[PDB]
Amino acid sequence: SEYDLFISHASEDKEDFVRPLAETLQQLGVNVWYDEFTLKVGDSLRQKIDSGLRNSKYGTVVLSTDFIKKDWTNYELDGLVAREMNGHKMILPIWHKITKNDVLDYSPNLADKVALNTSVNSIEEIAHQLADVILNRHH
Amino acid sequence: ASEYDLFISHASEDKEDFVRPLAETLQQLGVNVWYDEFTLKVGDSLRQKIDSGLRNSKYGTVVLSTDFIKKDWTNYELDGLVAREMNGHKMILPIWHKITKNDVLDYSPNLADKVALNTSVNSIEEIAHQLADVILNR
Fold it and tell me: What is the CA radius of gyration of chain B?
């Protein structure tokens, strides 16, 4: 209903990364659900994102190589990661297990976006960042 | 003190995806590079592979992916292997490929604040220029 955040991801990053992150976010009083937003190989990413944005104040995608390869049909994936509906907005994409070269091939525009990187940032740091935004902290 | 300029240790999953194009680029920049025999399969000995590569290669490097660290279950002290020195050869510039900060923190915490390359922030050509600068004293 009044969910704070949803996490779009690929099936491969669900238990490896998304679940601990969702639990860590729950520890900071952040309502987050992800089970229904796993991206299957034949699923439509746009449909999933708009559905989640209807019921969630904020959104984010876990960008891994699997993610961009799964939905082969997506040309303009760069626009999706900042999609906004009602007073809900998609924020802070998470570059998870992806290469700069891969991003350059599929969506070059994605390179110049505000994002988080799990190679340089831990789950706790990433959760604190998302919690800073969602909880209107230092503002 | 060897014939080959560089060898690349990697996991089986990054061989054709990453190590192959990177080695191809390195050869385009005049660096004798071989990686084909240094794939780390499950149950393999990382130390044995690294020492073997250092026998015939001036320099070495490891492609750190989550897969790579998962391979060697017997590897407790992985921090030392990525700077191992044998004869007059040294292991240089680890390449963080498809890894998490948490994953690295779990297996070898000392590596987290060590000089490395990141395939998420740097392209293959970008990474090869750094590698070739060091190996060829440019």
Answer: 14
**Side chain identity, residue A116:** L
Q: Which residue of B has its CA nearest to A117?
A: B120
How many beta-carbon contacts under 8 Å exist across A and B?
A: 47
The answer regarding whether domain A3-134 maps to CATH 3.40.50.10140 reads: yes
Residue type, position A50, single letter: D
Residue A100 contacts B, CB cutoff 8 Å: yes
Q: Are B61 and B50 in contact (CB under 8 A)?
A: no
Q: Is B19 helix (H, G, I), strand (E, B) or coil?
A: helix
Q: What resolution (Å)?
A: 3.0
Contact of B96 with chain A, judged by CB distance below 8 Å, is answered with yes
**Cα–Cα distance measured from residue B128 to residue A62, given in angstroms and rounded to the nearest whole number:** 27
Protein fold of B4-135? Rossmann fold (3.40.50)
Q: A63-80: b or e for each residue (b if 16 or more CB lie within 10 Å)?
A: bbbbbbebbeebeebbeb
